[PDB]
Amino acid sequence: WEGVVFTVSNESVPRWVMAQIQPAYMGLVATQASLAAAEAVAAVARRRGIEVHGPLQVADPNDPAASRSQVALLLSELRRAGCREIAVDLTGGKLPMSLGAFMAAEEAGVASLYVATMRTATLRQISQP
Amino acid sequence: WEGVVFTVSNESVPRWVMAQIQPAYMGLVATQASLAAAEAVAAVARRRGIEVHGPLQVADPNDPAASRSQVALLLSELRRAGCREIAVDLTGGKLPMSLGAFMAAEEAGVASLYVATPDMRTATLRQISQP
């Protein structure tokens, strides 16, 4: 892989993917709470020479559409910068972030990757076809 | 919703969703590690008059194809029993499970729901969709 777009909740797992595949371009989508992790990923990637796009923030992380659109923007920005082999690692983030990222990646025809290792609750809809 | 298919990791969350939706039909997909929790959801549901299908087991919880196919089996199974407005609740279980359940629900035309509330010594990178 030439490029990788990450949904981010922790910094350690994207770093390990970086070493595995050594891409030339990287995109980062985070929430407000996970922004510091995304910036930590960006900092190590910059000093290895990777071109870093983002982090982009999603206003509501429980809304898959928000994540989907941000990953879409980054997948386009990376294609523009001249990257042709892009994948989306959706390991990080809450479930709707990973789901929105997968949606963006299916909709652009790119490969999705994964790293195998109640009073507040609302019921929400992810998809209605 | 009159039918809900659940991916199961814990027993609490599905129970909570059951109380909110009051479904008539239920489907249950579990891993080996979560089969007991699913059986406990199933026991509670059958005593409330709910027709329960499963729990089915997925052998590889990291393979989304194995989750997709069990959820898809259960959705067709529920429809043949007379259920027709079904939602897939895909909280519970790891990401691959949830994504497999999302794939099966999209291909079946059903809505997907979600309840809104690490050691790197050994890791494998898997491709989950290769379009």
Residue numbers in the entry:
A (entry chain B): 67 to 183, 194 to 205
B (entry chain A): 67 to 183, 192 to 205
Give verbatim excerpts from the published study on this entry:
Prokaryotic type III CRISPR–Cas systems provide immunity against viruses and plasmids using CRISPR-associated Rossman fold (CARF) protein effectors. We studied WP_013033759 (hereafter named Cam1) from the halophilic Gram-negative chromatiaceae Nitrosococcus halophilus Nc4, which contains a CARF domain fused to a transmembrane domain that does not seem to be capable of degrading nucleic acids, as is the case for all the previously characterized CARF effectors. N. halophilus Cam1 (hereafter NhCam1) has a molecular mass of 22.3 kDa and contains 206 amino acids, with an N-terminal transmembrane helix (TMH) predicted to be 24 amino acids in length by deepTMHMM26 followed by an equally short linker (L1) and a C-terminal intracellular CARF domain. Here we investigated the structure and function of Cam1, a CARF effector that lacks a nuclease domain, but contains a TMH domain that promotes the formation of a tetrameric pore that is required to provide immunity through membrane depolarization and growth arrest of the infected cell (Supplementary Discussion).
We next grew crystals and solved the structure NhCam1-CARF (residues 42–206) in the absence and presence of bound cA4. The 2.2 Å-resolution X-ray structure without the ligand showed that NhCam1-CARF adopts a domain-swapped dimeric topology, in which the β7 strand of one monomer completes the folding topology of a second monomer by pairing with its β6 strand. Loop L2 connects β6 and β7 in one monomer, but this loop is disordered in the other monomer; loop L1 is disordered in both monomers of the CARF dimer. We identified 56 different Cam1 homologues, which we used to perform a MUSCLE protein sequence alignment, finding that D17, but not S24, is highly conserved.
